[PDB]
């Protein structure tokens, strides 16, 4: 009865509460209750992969070709560019890496907290500037459009990686 695939039934665990849910869970991984994943880990991982993939797409576009902040020269697709930016300004790229690492450590503590109690929802960091949580409809629409356009980000980034890696 799954909306995505009528021939295989929708999982019992998926009730559609989470955004972007079309009952598309053939292997039924959401049912996992072992090794500590349990569909809250998967939701968090989806949101994180998708956000960082959107950033990756925007970065690879490189339309301005001013190297983001001034002082960053030259344009290259992926690997040579990463190495060259690291070479010219290791101080800034290391700073960005450590910013991401700090948010990651705090996020991991938060993941454990959300596991223990439902206070922290999946993909939630209270980073909303609009602070819009009174009425559900707008929050749900924004969240599900985020997930959709980030899934597109991930697929586009695969379209990028595939080129130049084959024989």
């Amino acid at each position: 009865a799954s909306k995505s695939l009528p021939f295989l039934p929708k999982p019992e665990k998926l009730d559609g509460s989470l955004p972007g849910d079309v009952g598309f869970d053939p292997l039924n991984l959401s049912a996992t209750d072992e090794l500590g994943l349990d569909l809250y880990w998967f939701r968090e991982a989806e949101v994180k992969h998708g956000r960082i993939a959107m950033l990756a797409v925007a970065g690879v576009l490189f339309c301005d070709q001013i190297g983001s902040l001034p002082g960053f020269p030259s344009g290259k697709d992926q690997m040579d560019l990463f190495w060259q930016v690291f070479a010219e300004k290791p101080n800034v790229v290391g700073a960005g890496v450590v910013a991401v690492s700090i948010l990651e450590f705090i996020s991991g503590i938060a993941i454990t907290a959300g596991r223990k109690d439902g206070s922290r929802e999946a993909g939630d960091f209270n980073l909303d500037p609009f602070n819009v949580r009174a009425d559900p409809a707008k929050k749900a629409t924004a969240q599900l459009q985020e997930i959709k356009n980030g899934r597109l980000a991930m697929l586009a980034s695969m379209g990028m990686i595939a080129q130049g890696m084959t024989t």
Partner: protein
Amino acid sequence: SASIPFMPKPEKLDGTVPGDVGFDPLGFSNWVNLDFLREAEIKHGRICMLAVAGWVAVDLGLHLPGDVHNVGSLEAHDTAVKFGAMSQILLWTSIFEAISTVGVVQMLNGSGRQPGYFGFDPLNFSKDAASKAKLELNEIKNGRLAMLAFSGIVTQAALGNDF
């Protein structure tokens, strides 16, 4: 939870430690004595505040009359260990630290000593009117700031002369 609003409400926190804001992601305090942690934090902060003051002082200023002080801060440790002043400061700080180790053990046993209580108020800047808690919040906060600032200063001076 204070500051970080999505963290799990730091346990055995607040109600003490004027400098606290509720930021304990790893939460070591839960499984270790809070008094020991407070003592460690305060001592690190004091030592590093003095370290920042010394590093800025050595920055082409206030050098002592001896010729060995034409040397800079980066090379100061080597010139001092060779000159032997470093060994002497080690001696005196070790004496103070042993006398304070007795106090740390007493504090842990339940002697009632406050973490950083060393009764050192020659000019008694503190007063009941001044509010010891207000005086300490600044102490702890500027100490943490100095900790981080000195770490940065030494690292980025090992990269290139900050000034």
